[PDB]
Amino acid sequence: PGMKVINDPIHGHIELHPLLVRIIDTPQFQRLRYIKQLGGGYYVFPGASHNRFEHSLGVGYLAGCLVHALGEKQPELQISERDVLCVQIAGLCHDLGHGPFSHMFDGRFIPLARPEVKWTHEQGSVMMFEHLINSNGIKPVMEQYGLIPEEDICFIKEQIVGPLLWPYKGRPENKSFLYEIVSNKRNGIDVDKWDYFARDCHHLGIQNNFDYKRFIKFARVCEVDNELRICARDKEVGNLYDMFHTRNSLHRRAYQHKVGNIIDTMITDAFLKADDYIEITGAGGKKYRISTAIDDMEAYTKLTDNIFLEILYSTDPKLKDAREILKQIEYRNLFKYVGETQPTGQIKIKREDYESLPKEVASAKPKVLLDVKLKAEDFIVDVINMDKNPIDHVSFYCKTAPNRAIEQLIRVYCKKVDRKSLYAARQYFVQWCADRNFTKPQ
Amino acid sequence: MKVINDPIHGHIELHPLLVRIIDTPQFQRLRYIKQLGGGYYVFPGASHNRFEHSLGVGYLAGCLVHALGEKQPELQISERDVLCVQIAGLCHDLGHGPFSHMFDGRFIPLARPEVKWTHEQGSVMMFEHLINSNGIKPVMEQYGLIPEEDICFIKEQIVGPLLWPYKGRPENKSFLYEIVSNKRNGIDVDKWDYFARDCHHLGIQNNFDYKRFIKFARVCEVDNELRICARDKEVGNLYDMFHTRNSLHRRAYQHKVGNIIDTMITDAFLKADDYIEITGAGGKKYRISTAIDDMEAYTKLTDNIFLEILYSTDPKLKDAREILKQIEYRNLFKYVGETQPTGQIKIKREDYESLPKEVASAKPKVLLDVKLKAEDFIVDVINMDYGMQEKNPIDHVSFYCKTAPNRAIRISQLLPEKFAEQLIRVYCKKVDRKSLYAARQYFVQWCADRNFTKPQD
Amino acid sequence: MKVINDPIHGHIELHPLLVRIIDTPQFQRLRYIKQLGGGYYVFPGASHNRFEHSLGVGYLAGCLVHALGEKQPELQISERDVLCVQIAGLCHDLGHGPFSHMFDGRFIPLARPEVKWTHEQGSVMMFEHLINSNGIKPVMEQYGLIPEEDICFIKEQIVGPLDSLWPYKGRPENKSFLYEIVSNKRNGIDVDKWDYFARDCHHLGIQNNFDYKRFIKFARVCEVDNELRICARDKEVGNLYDMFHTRNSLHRRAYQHKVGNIIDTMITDAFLKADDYIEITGAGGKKYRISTAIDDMEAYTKLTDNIFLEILYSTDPKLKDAREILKQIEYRNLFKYVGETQPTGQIKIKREDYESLPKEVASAKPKVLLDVKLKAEDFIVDVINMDYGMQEKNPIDHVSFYCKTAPNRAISQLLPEKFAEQLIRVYCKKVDRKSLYAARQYFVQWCADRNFTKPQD
Amino acid sequence: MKVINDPIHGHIELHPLLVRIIDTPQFQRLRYIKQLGGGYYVFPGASHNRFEHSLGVGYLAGCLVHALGEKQPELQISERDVLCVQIAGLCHDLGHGPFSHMFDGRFIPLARPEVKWTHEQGSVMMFEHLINSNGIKPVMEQYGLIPEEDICFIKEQIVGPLEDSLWPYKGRPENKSFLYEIVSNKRNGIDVDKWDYFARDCHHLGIQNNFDYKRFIKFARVCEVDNELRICARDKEVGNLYDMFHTRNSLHRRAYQHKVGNIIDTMITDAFLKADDYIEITGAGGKKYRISTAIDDMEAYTKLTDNIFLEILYSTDPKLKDAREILKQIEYRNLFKYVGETQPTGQIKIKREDYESLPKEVASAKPKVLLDVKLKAEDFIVDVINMDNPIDHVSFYCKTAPNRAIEQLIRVYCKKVDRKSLYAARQYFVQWCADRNFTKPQD
Ligand SMILES: Nc1nc2c(ncn2[C@H]2CC[C@@H](COP(=O)(O)OP(=O)(O)OP(=O)(O)O)O2)c(=O)[nH]1
Ligand SMILES: Nc1nc2c(ncn2[C@H]2CC[C@@H](COP(=O)(O)OP(=O)(O)OP(=O)(O)O)O2)c(=O)[nH]1
Ligand SMILES: Nc1nc2c(ncn2[C@H]2CC[C@@H](COP(=O)(O)OP(=O)(O)OP(=O)(O)O)O2)c(=O)[nH]1
Ligand SMILES: Nc1nc2c(ncn2[C@H]2CC[C@@H](COP(=O)(O)OP(=O)(O)OP(=O)(O)O)O2)c(=O)[nH]1
Ligand SMILES: Nc1nc2c(ncn2[C@H]2CC[C@@H](COP(=O)(O)OP(=O)(O)OP(=O)(O)O)O2)c(=O)[nH]1
Ligand SMILES: Nc1nc2c(ncn2[C@H]2CC[C@@H](COP(=O)(O)OP(=O)(O)OP(=O)(O)O)O2)c(=O)[nH]1
Ligand SMILES: Nc1nc2c(ncn2[C@H]2CC[C@@H](COP(=O)(O)OP(=O)(O)OP(=O)(O)O)O2)c(=O)[nH]1
Ligand SMILES: Nc1nc2c(ncn2[C@H]2CC[C@@H](COP(=O)(O)OP(=O)(O)OP(=O)(O)O)O2)c(=O)[nH]1
Ligand SMILES: [Fe+3]
Ligand SMILES: [Fe+3]
Ligand SMILES: [Fe+3]
Ligand SMILES: [Fe+3]
Ligand SMILES: [Mg+2]
Ligand SMILES: [Mg+2]
Ligand SMILES: [Mg+2]
Ligand SMILES: [Mg+2]
């Protein structure tokens, strides 16, 4: 069986089964070369040039390592070569659905452009994966290696987006542990996070003391509360604490960076101003816009970070408004940071209300008379989401007896950089916080 | 003063003047040009761009001058000098085009053989455009720079002298010209960065330590010229440098599939060249091969042109697109063989275009079952350093003693052999079993009458 | 199967047999002896003991055989061999005494000039004492070792052969490369040095540019003049140059430290003054003294750095003279430094003459005669050897390299000059301005009369 | 001025006054006491001693005062202050006994339950003894120190206020309050002492340390917080502090709280107790003290170091046979076996005075199904491990507007290693937990 070997800066040599190679070499997979992992992060962190493509190879690699390690150590689990491939394909394809600049796309842009629509890149990954297998005739290739397509493709989608009393149609309840590999949000520990923790740390120059190889050699499937779940050896606990500290550090230092997130709302603002005028040719030659390409995977296949440059380089005076914001990024005249607040206890601010937020802020009236008035378009309101002692939700096992177990941050920016426009914005913002019952700004 | 965190160097502090230069459309362009060109399509970690490389070299440039200045106040290194050395480091790669070395090393030679073009020339041109467009000269004067001398100094550090040849600095500061680009012994801050950075991204170990070497550098008189010298105990570090360089050339820059892919991208650019319009100065329209003539058009020419071609519906570009679609589907030119010009004169850029027809015209002894025209051949010339003959860089490094600084130590089989090479590879665009068989002996016969080495089996 | 975490080597996995040997009074004894002896009284970070160094050498020893055995199966390296190399690594320093090299390099020579003793000899004796006392031989057999072949192999790996006939009884000549692992006296490259270079550096805060992991990765056993020997890959030459400079740095900065050595002679002076009065109970209940404790391993087992505090804390008025010298160390009233000389182009001083030396200094005739004169008891003469009883050799000569394309066959004033020196220093026990002036003149005359080099100012 | 090369801090410069203080039997003593005590028997890199740690803290304390005095000359920081903070840094651990925290944390409570003893108290006593014994007061005066003003300040920095809501410190006025936050800060637990041993313990244990103290010192400022002058961090140095706290948590989890490490420290303690009666240390006036009584006289205590371990191990004396055999069990690596772990239930802390009673409570527990072995109190070891988010108790300041701010673990070991003794000890232990209402031991 002919394997491709890929040298990876994080995992070293990655061997790829011919089936994975066929899936990798499609316009739909190669597309991920053109989407930055951290999006606007790159404009803060010069080392963060990495793309979704290499990350996905990693997740596919690690996904395989874990199933195979489990299968070798516990043959009773009945893990087939068919299972290993399906877990690897899920690992490979879990991010197919991301759009330009990754989380900026499904996390801010689509909510702003089309508030009524519900879209996640996970939903995209399932759609794009379906599009991928159909477009490139993957089903025969699967059958050749013993995969049964209607049976397994379902499994794969479920590993990505979740169940489409045992909710899963792709595998029976006795293999339930397989669903904990690629995406696990019970305890938020999975091969996806293992790759991007190590890979972001590598490109951001942040210290990562978590050893994922250790964790995989010692992973075991044990019965917990009637349920088969992946468990860690008890003395790997110190390792787990290192993982959680690495994750916290990536969030405070990188994902939540004040300038990083500012720049991402600027790229978003430019997309919104370009949305009317940009045409992406989809299936049947129909034309979609940036916000609608998610509706058709053929158009969406051509929607990547390139759209940034398409806007930047364009001559069309209709795109002038979009273009000048991107030029603002280039010249580094950025939105200025007004303040930060949290919603107290309560309910989370929701994506469908994102569009409404700047108008709420501008409609606040601070109690001292202010001689500057600011429109709602003068404001940017940025909703940043986060996800306890995390070690309690991890299940462990003892060596001597295995098979036995033992959040919203809200920032506001102003497009006006002169002092008393900025002074005004501050007053709007503190007042808005007061009457929406948010925490009082520093 | 801005601080930028970098995975190779850690914290890079930037003087306000540098920040002014960096925050321009001409510098930010380098975010959109991959360092290793087609390398990325082989090494998934090699997503890095010219931008971060440039910040790095500007930073290393600064570290080295500053280190010398503190250890040797007699050198009379001014703060004016250090900023100039930093800007040169920062701007040395400004002239790179889409996919870096693919552009000036193959594409331009194929498109416009008559023209002589290096990205270094581009960097000097682009640096001028950056300064004029963004009014940097007043900002230079503000910080104590004299624009007409210092701008010359900076350009000279990049492309060399435009009987002491340099107009930008006198002969007593000559050692400053050894920092950004050193052509004698190839030891400079530019290589230190991309050695460290490429290794970081390729997952190849770099055993050269630049911090050690910078700590111990001195300027000493050697053959009545001021030169940067290494202390004697650094000999081991320099050998590691020369070996890291070899690994990078052999494992990465010369990678067979990587270079095939660079010829596919180039083949795509050529087939797209007539029909693509880039808007330059005075609203004039330029092509990919022509964008080098105007810095305003060239500012808009980056790797993006690959995707512009790939996503395009225009049927005039269908041919360019079909090659780029081939790369995505991973049906690539197939590799015929490799040969070297031993004892003969190495192939020159102006002759690259002619090479495929020589191959198609070879006429092998046996009758062929399939005939191949030159459309079908790709001939790739791979140079370590183009237009440089072979030198042992260890010779041109001067060392100094603990007990006798300020004077060099007076001056093997374990070093890398080859420091400037020419490799000639041939690929065939037809992938069927008997077309390829044809291509091989066309190639073997082609080698024979140019008296190149007989391809190994 | 125990794993022990180490700050230099990370995780060290220990075969049960090694653990069994380690968990004995004779091995745990090494916890109580400082690696650098008096170095600690100058380098506060140098708290490390023989114990952790020995685990390291055991670890590195195992790493190298395994790397050789796995890459070159033709060498037929057995599990029996790997264990024996590990035991040798672990036990090579068993024989060190209180404050390490102070003990066999100075104290014993001064106490018993007649005796020829090395700590390596000690290691052989202590290893024998260890295996007998703790019933290791059955445990050896249990794991596939043949005790009187292997114990012999292990001892020979430590102390050497017990003309040009093959001297080793423990292993045949086709495995000869095994004897190059723990102790290599031809080129001074072995796992012992690797560990303490890295370990001493770590505690002294000195940078270690030698990477042993790399060297082990690339090591091969090849043909050299009839002879099977461990060889380095050609690209590792830079790493070996770094090893030699680190060694030179450690020797110059730490082992030859002025105060460090003054303090070790003070401790020795204390031991001598205490030697008559301290009984250590050995085998058969017989009583041994500090200097005779080397005669019986049961007594020697209880002889560690502890003897320093025993003397210091003692009430016995017999011990007051010894005690007072150790107390002067605490108060930092030390022997004062007179000067340094070398026996260049002369015959080097031998251990059996050490005691005679102060008498020679005190008997020199300095004159112009001075109003102060000194007895021999007022002088301390310190002989500092890089390698004792070893001729000056350049070690890169005697290292063989190999080429990739010829996997098996073997193929410098940028290097340290210095590989075997004798340094002779003189201290004076009297601290007044005029005695000190007198002692200098005695010393300068003594140098002249032995035709050693003239003391500097 | 002497320079000392140190593997953690690089070159450390020592003022002549400090050198005078260092070169005494009372300070040099710390060369003979392991930082991590029994830790060395688990972690071979942990050979470091109190001596080098104290130089470090003396060095860092100085770096911080000097950085403050220079960036804020309005703050009144004199050279007299800088020297006094350095001495406090230098001498803060003078009071540690054999194997450090084993001595004051377990041994002394077991030997003399009635006595209240901390090594910080020792440090103050030993420091007084150091200055008197060696004639340090004149030397202080040469360099501008006033001995009974300053000695008081130095002691206060170490043991805290000696003798409510008034300003408790006599050694410095309240406008110097920030000085008392440098060497020892109980309030928020961030000081030069921890910085040193976090970095030093990590270096010797091979644990990665991401906290950079040098940056933190560069950005430190004194600001007004609630009536009070206090040391503050620049606001986005918050990230550095999180790394410090992660290092602290890791060191407690991987090292200080290590199972075998602590077990061996109870074995050393058990040997000391059985040796206590018979060992004589000569104190002042030729008076003889015991291991446990040496804390009562600093001249005796001066000669009490890790050496006492070997004195026992090497002794021929048959009264010491019991002590010697325990230490021999350590050497042969036959160790007390781990029975279980529990935590006391809400609020209540087991107190040092009651430690002795704990093995007898356990042994007197009535496990309810009856078992074939009975165990004495001497068969049990009860080990109480005390813990020394945190960002809320740190005060920060803004760059643009500085001046203004923005449990217990209980383990049980059994000394008899035969299998069914262990089954028994387990049942004694689970039951003891039950009727003292501690958390139920995991299975
Ligand atoms: N100016 C600039 N900074 C960069 C770039 N890439 C990374 N950085 C680093 C430097 C600081 C950080 C962002 O700095 P900004 O220029 O956004 O500074 P700011 O915080 O918006 O403005 P200010 O510093 O005035 O508050 O990211 C770049 O291309 N230009
Ligand atoms: N700025 C921003 N960051 C986000 C958003 N959602 C998540 N992040 C941060 C938190 C984690 C990090 C990566 O997200 P995931 O944990 O989903 O990892 P991923 O591999 O990128 O996502 P997935 O595999 O689900 O596509 O990015 C968002 O909407 N906006
Ligand atoms: N197939 C493939 N390989 C990749 C990719 N990215 C990196 N690589 C690595 C693995 C193999 C190497 C390129 O080799 P190819 O797969 O093109 O193989 P080839 O030698 O050209 O043809 P073949 O092996 O089919 O005979 O680079 C990718 O997207 N697809
Ligand atoms: N594919 C390809 N690679 C090249 C060519 N010329 C050089 N290379 C390889 C060998 C070294 C590396 C570039 O080294 P340079 O010293 O030119 O460094 P650079 O930073 O890329 O360019 P600059 O000289 O402008 O700094 O890329 C070429 O024409 N084509
Ligand atoms: N004084 C002293 N120095 C130490 C100690 N530990 C390490 N050192 C370093 C500092 C200097 C070196 C020993 O130098 P000494 O002060 O003993 O000798 P010196 O340098 O000639 O000092 P001086 O000229 O004052 O006598 O070792 C210590 O405990 N006391
Ligand atoms: N002070 C002193 N230093 C010595 C003497 N002999 C050697 N040294 C220095 C030079 C090297 C360093 C260690 O020497 P070794 O190579 O013997 O190494 P070791 O590991 O200490 O002992 P062994 O050879 O038994 O392993 O100590 C001596 O007699 N006195
Ligand atoms: N045996 C032994 N282990 C050591 C030494 N130094 C460090 N270690 C490490 C290796 C294992 C770790 C724990 O010690 P042990 O394994 O002896 O104790 P344990 O693990 O509780 O005993 P066990 O697992 O055999 O019941 O300590 C040493 O000198 N001897
Ligand atoms: N075994 C044991 N460890 C302890 C005890 N108290 C604290 N520890 C651990 C946790 C932190 C580490 C050092 O604590 P300290 O903050 O006291 O630091 P120190 O330098 O050792 O002592 P000091 O407070 O006098 O400076 O030792 C104890 O009572 N027993
Ligand atoms: Fe992902
Ligand atoms: Fe460059
Ligand atoms: Fe050794
Ligand atoms: Fe302390
Ligand atoms: Mg291939
Ligand atoms: Mg900024
Ligand atoms: Mg164990
Ligand atoms: Mg001295």
Numbering used by the authors:
A (entry chain D): 113 to 276, 284 to 506, 512 to 530, 547 to 582
B (entry chain C): 115 to 276, 284 to 532, 538 to 583
C (entry chain A): 115 to 276, 282 to 530, 538 to 583
D (entry chain B): 115 to 277, 282 to 506, 513 to 530, 547 to 583
Please, what does the article write about this entry?
SAMHD1 is a restriction factor that blocks infection of certain immune cells by HIV-1. SAMHD1 is a GTP/dGTP-activated deoxynucleotide triphosphohydrolase. Human SAMHD1 is a 626 amino acid protein comprising an N-terminal nuclear localisation signal, two major structural domains; a sterile alpha motif (SAM) and an HD domain, together with CtD, a C-terminal region required for interaction with Vpx isolated from SIV that infects sooty mangabey (SIVsmm). The HD domain contains the active site of the protein and in combination with N- and C-terminal sequences also incorporates the two allosteric nucleotide-binding sites, AL1 and AL2, that regulate the enzyme through combined binding of G-based (AL1) and deoxynucleoside (AL2) triphosphates.
